[PDB]
Amino acid sequence: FDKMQAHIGEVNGTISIGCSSLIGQTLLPEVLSLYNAQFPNVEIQVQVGSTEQIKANHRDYHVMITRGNKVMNLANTHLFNDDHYFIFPKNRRDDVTKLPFIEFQADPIYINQIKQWYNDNLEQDYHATITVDQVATCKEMLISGVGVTILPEIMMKNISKEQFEFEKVEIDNEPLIRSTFMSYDPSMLQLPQVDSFVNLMASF
Amino acid sequence: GEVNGTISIGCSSLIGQTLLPEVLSLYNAQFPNVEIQVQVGSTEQIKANHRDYHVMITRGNKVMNLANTHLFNDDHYFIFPKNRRDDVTKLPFIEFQADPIYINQIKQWYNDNLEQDYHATITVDQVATCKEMLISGVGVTILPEIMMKNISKEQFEFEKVEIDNEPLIRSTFMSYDPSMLQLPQVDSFVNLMASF
Numbered sequence: 310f311d312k313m314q315a316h317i318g319e320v321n322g323t324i325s326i327g328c329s330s331l332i333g334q335t336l337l338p339e340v341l342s343l344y345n346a347q348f349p350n351v352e353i354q355v356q357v358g359s360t361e362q363i364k365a366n367h368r369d370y371h372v373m374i375t376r377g378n379k380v381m382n383l384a385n386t387h388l389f390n391d392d393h394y395f396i397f398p399k400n401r402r403d404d405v406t407k408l409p410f411i412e413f414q415a416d417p418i419y420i421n422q423i424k425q426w427y428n429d430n431l432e433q434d435y436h437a438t439i440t441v442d443q444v445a446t447c448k449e450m451l452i453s454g455v456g457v458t459i460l461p462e463i464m465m466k467n468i469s470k471e472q473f474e475f476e477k478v479e480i481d482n483e484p485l486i487r488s489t490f491m492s493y494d495p496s497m498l499q500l501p502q503v504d505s506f507v508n509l510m511a512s513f
Numbered sequence: 514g515e516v517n518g519t520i521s522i523g524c525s526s527l528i529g530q531t532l533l534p535e536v537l538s539l540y541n542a543q544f545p546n547v548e549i550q551v552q553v554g555s556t557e558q559i560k561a562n563h564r565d566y567h568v569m570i571t572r573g574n575k576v577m578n579l580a581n582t583h584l585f586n587d588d589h590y591f592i593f594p595k596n597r598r599d600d601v602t603k604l605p606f607i608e609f610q611a612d613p614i615y616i617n618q619i620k621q622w623y624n625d626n627l628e629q630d631y632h633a634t635i636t637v638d639q640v641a642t643c644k645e646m647l648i649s650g651v652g653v654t655i656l657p658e659i660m661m662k663n664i665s666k667e668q669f670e671f672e673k674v675e676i677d678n679e680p681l682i683r684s685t686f687m688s689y690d691p692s693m694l695q696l697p698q699v700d701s702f703v704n705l706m707a708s709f
């Protein structure tokens with residue numbers, strides 16, 4: 310009990326984390342809650358923004374968690390890959406082309422991939438008839454029955470399997486995926502609050 | 514059947530996430546022959562793109578040279594775990610991205626009421642992220658009423674935000690050129706959104 314408290318107390322100081330949008334909304338809060346419980350003496354600083362923003366501000370952070378590609382001159386730990394699903398009301402299989410497509414703001418390489426897939430699979434020109442700034446707005450539009458969309462798996466929690474059909478997105482019989490990486494200077498692992506965070510996040 | 518054609522709507526972020534979807538669902542059901550086009554972005558972005566839309570719905574101020582119908586005012590609440598009422602100053606404040614006048618008002622309130630310098634120890638790009646951080650017990654925040662649905666009254670305490678005994682409010686307006694009301698799909702939308 311003395312040594313348990315000793316270790317808990319021991320890990321302290323500050324950790325600054327930069328995290329991309331989707332994971333920041335869905336998984337980070339849970340991780341941070343667990344991290345505060347296990348390591349109450351460390352002060353957290355967090356930014357959640359687009360991958361591009363976080364990568365631009367890399368000097369602000371001990372650790373970055375981003376969707377896209379590895380960051381050069383840093384260690385990169387692969388956390389997971391995400392598949393993507395075309396989602397539409399189950400009751401409406403046939404006339405999917407007539408429903409508005411809901412587009413959320415994201416990396417332009419990603420959007421152009423989605424557009425391509427739409428062209429080739431609905432055999433009709435892609436048009437974002439509903440365009441939104443925030444992913445949760447996209448999800449709310451979907452859930453309320455207003456349209457169809459494509460979401461990565463991480464955003465698909467609490468979407469009724471009873472109400473909606475899910476079609477895995479593939480381009481030239483290759484699943485559209487995005488990888489998420491945790492990136493840091495390896496020497497930052499000598500800080501115990503950072504080492505602790507990195508192993509906790511990687512264990513999810 | 515009669516009411517048809519296209520309507521293009523621009524809407525600010527919070528209402529776009531929270532109320533617009535419901536309105537659009539009702540509007541599709543009542544007027545199935547009209548094709549909707551929608552953009553949800555920040556107030557500034559929607560106002561900048563005003564020529565793209567028949568109707569704008571935004572939080573902030575009226576738009577000049579357009580008709581403006583006041584939809585509702587929002588109060589704002591400081592929200593923290595009941596579980597930690599005492600040491601609120603120690604918890605991280607969660608800031609969502611918003612216009613700088615609003616943030617400066619939040620900062621000022623924090624200074625004068627927690628008697629400690631405001632610092633956004635958790636800053637997030639999207640309001641739903643702020644709400645998720647709050648709900649998971651990570652910190653404290655200030656939300657406008659419209660974003661407060663499904664926050665447990667059992668788990669959290671709510672303190673109305675006031676500056677010099679004046680409630681911090683934001684108004685939401687629907688704005689359009691009055692001549693757009695001659696389009697029945699637009700007239701229909703405007704009266705639905707205003708009644709909701």
Ligand SMILES: [Cl-]
Binds near residue numbers: 332375376
């Ligand atoms: Cl992400």
Ligand SMILES: [Cl-]
Binds near residue numbers: 527529571572
């Ligand atoms: Cl708003």
